[PDB]
């Protein structure tokens, strides 16, 4: 297991624009186009982004071009920044691939703010750390996914994966 194969489980993969759990437009694996209402819009962001004449439906290829970009951008987000980068830093392989999923998921900013939490996390005090992370939004509306990258965190192990 490893970030990818964990985060194709957790966003799936579909080939035709559609929406997601908070009502917007994304394709591929979990790449959110955009946050407007139009389908003009999010079909214009597709095709910026692939570099073609889309029409809404992509190949499996682009998809995982643009997964793989996108994984690239979360990883050098959190590099970038001063409050996640020696976080990160301090922890091991597992705990970091779950890390990356929150930003993936959340962008870097929503991850940035769970201050209370990143400190936790940065004194290997997992339980409190795992205690804190569901008191949020985040947990009340995807609560399966966040179980799962909450418990990995806890754990450092892949199990609820398995
Ligand atoms: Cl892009
Ligand atoms: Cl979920």
Known sequence: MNIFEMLRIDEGLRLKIY????????????????????????????????????????????AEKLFNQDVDAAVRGILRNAKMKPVYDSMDAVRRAAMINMVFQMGETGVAGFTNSL???????????????????????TPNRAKRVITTMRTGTWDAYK
């Open 19 to 62: 929406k997601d759990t908070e009502g917007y437009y994304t394709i591929g694996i979990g790449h959110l186009l955009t946050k407007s209402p139009s389908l003009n819009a999010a079909k214009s962001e597709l095709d910026k982004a692939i570099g073609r004449n889309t029409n809404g439906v992509i190949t499996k290829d682009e």
């Open 119 to 141: 400190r936790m996390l940065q004194q290997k005090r997992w339980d409190e750390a795992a205690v804190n992370l569901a008191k949020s939004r985040w947990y009340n509306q």
